[PDB]
Curated annotation (Swiss-Prot), chains A, B:
Coiled coil: none annotated. It is found in: Host nucleus. Belongs to the papillomaviridae E2 protein family. Residues 3-83 are annotated as: DNA-binding domain. It comes from the Viruses. Transmembrane segments: none annotated. Phosphorylated. This is Regulatory protein E2. There is a cross-link at K10 (Glycyl lysine isopeptide (Lys-Gly) (interchain with G-Cter in SUMO)).
Length: 83, 83
């Protein structure tokens, strides 16, 4: 038993860098956040990095994307680390 | 229907950077690889970055970690982007 539901917030590296501040406001449901990175690599960046957050229970994951006021510039994508 | 099985190869940023070369040898089952990043961030790095790979079918995921000779320095962890 483990269930490690995570989400991918894609949008910008500067928006996600300061997004962690809002995650602190809702820590009761937030667990940890990954370092904003980018899918693959061609030469540098282009305003489009996704970070991997993680919660404790599956209900805490859906509550995060439906409770904290995430920035519209970013986009939450269901995820499942299963680890 | 989608099933996007992915794996996390944690170990080193230099070992994972050159690991992509081996992934090319087995592209028939490999699909795409993510940019080696690090879980969270305290100040810099410390030889421990994880990359997110992706396959086409679930059977292709288990075959990747059981077919390509991955480096022992790294570690494959089951993953499920579900996206």
């Amino acid at each position: 038993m483990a269930t490690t539901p995570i989400i991918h917030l894609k949008g910008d590296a500067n928006i996600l860098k300061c997004l962690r501040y809002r995650l602190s406001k809702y820590k009761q449901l937030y667990e940890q956040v990954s370092s904003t990175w980018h899918w693959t690599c061609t030469d540098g960046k282009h305003k489009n990095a996704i970070v991997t957050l993680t919660y404790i229970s599956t209900s805490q994951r859906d509550d995060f994307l439906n409770t904290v006021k995430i920035p519209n510039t970013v986009s939450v994508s269901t995820g499942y680390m299963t680890i």
